[PDB]
Design a protein around this nucleic acid. Sequence first.
DNA 1: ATTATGACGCT
DNA 2: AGCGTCAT
Length: 430
Amino acid sequence: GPHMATGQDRVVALVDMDCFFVQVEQRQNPHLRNKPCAVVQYKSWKGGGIIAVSYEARAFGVTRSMWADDAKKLCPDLLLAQVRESRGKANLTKYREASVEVMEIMSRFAVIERASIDEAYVDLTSAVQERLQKLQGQPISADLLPSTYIEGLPQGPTVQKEGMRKQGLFQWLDSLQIDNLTSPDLQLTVGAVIVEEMRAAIERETGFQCSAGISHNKVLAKLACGLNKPNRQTLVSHGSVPQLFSQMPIRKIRSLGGKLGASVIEILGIEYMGELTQFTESQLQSHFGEKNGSWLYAMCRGIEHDPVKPRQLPKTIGCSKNFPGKTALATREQVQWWLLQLAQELEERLTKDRNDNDRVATQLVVSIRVQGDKRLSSLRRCCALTRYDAHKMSHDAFTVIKNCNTSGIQTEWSPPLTMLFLCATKFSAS
DNA sequence: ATTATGACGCT
DNA sequence: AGCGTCAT
Ligand SMILES: Nc1nc2c(ncn2[C@H]2C[C@H](O)[C@@H](COP(=O)(O)NP(=O)(O)OP(=O)(O)O)O2)c(=O)[nH]1
Ligand SMILES: [Mn+2]
Ligand SMILES: [Mn+2]
């Protein structure tokens, strides 16, 4: 009872940009704004592959992973923006730079953990304590939470979406105990006030809209963020978890959408996250390993301890290109030329990183996939990265992979290469 | 012929 | 170190 810690000692937020690459292109080209729009890579095969979709286009069924030609079948008026091509490959620099814009704004409010190109976690515990001190026991006005949903509310004792949002927020605020500076629900609420401010700053200073989740840990904050996209934020309280999880398919939790989640479902004969509560920690560890079992035991109760890492910058800088079907690389000249193209993009990104961030990569990882291998990487080899020189980097990558070529002929490459991947790692302060 | 990444955990 | 998983 009293000693049963409830995982309520942090306030954590997840901010995720809405249809990010689309918004970057819509900012640049006003003709794309408020339109069914998608961003594609390449064009020749099937119109190119969609990687981002505006909410207007989603209404027609357009999704990521879909070929543009098929998306145009669903949405004949769909507008498309193509990712830049440089050195024969997709070049995502514009979106990385836009990401830095957003990350730098978020860092004004708190130390952030860059989780992807378009989203970051925020540990707001300390900022919340500060704002609570300033509030001096003053209640929180609904006016300070103009885009916030309270998950699970309204409940009990109404036709529009905004009305339901406000009804739930009123029910939440009316139940708050604002004289207790240690109440977790009050802390989450102040966290949501701060996140409104953060999202307002992002939109004012970049033009980009985002959604956010506020809860007591990273998993719940991420889940919360997705509940009311776009352009809204959602508060998931500890108390909302039993009802939320009682009908939550296990695969919606970050980390359980793959083989492990399928094994939870099949071994235990359950469907929803809430059903996990009936098992002991030891039973879950027996099926899924010590670490996974402890994580599942706490997570189905709303408890997760993974810290918000103080990391605004990516840990690696990588360049990759697939060569599908008849485009697979079958000669040594081809392999060398594309290793050089990848290495030249890598050199440019690494040099900019060194200038911006006062660090140097020290390890080069070379990954290839070979024809007939379904795995992502057929082979990974590391070597030293001692100079930011594309020619050296590509020569070294060739040296570490050249023993893969089973061809007796010096010129041919067999079996052909369907992917090249260069990734700079193990950064050191310079 | 989804593609381009990037984060990890395992052994 | 190299491989596998998850993510999108
Ligand atoms: N190159 C590449 N980029 C991708 C891929 N998947 C996503 N991206 C890029 C394009 C995405 O814009 C960006 C962020 O990914 P999300 O947050 O998962 N999706 P979004 O922000 O679009 O919509 P929502 O409002 O639902 O969050 O990452 C991919 O497979 N490949
Ligand atoms: Mn997003
Ligand atoms: Mn995202």
